[PDB]
């Protein structure tokens, strides 16, 4: 069998440093703020959700917590 896990592949990533948002459209993180990646783009920006926040942000910058997401970019 296999029986996947249909629910949410949200990616938990912690901010890196004081990151100011260029616009409200984008996200904004400071420090110690786990963000939830929903989009997950390889273009360069990453769209997720922060504690009562949202928008796009640099994933490369922020750190990754999920160990099942690191070696598992969703699917491919």
Contact 66, 11 (CB under 8 A): yes
In total, the chain counts a number of residues equal to 76
Taking Cα atoms as reference points, which of 49, 46, 50, 58 lies closest to residue 16? 58
- As for how many domains the chain has, the answer is 1
Q: Confirm if 55 and 25 have CB atoms less than 8 A apart.
A: yes
What residues make up the domain containing 32?
1-76
* Percent composition of the chain: helix, strand, coil (DSSP 3-state, to 5): 5, 30, 65
How are strands ordered across the β-sheet holding 35-37? 53-57, 46-50, 35-37, 11-14, 63-64
Domain with residue 9: its CATH number is 2.30.30.40
Chain breaks in the chain (C to N over 2.5 A) after: none
């Amino acid at each position: 069998g296999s029986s996947g896990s249909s629910g949410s592949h949200q990616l938990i990533v912690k901010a890196r440093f004081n990151f100011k948002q260029t616009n409200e459209d984008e996200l904004s993180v400071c420090k110690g703020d786990i963000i939830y990646v929903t989009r997950v783009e390889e273009g360069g920006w990453w769209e997720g959700t922060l504690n009562g926040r949202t928008g796009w942000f640099p994933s490369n910058y922020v750190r990754e917590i999920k160990s099942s997401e690191r070696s598992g970019p969703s699917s491919g």
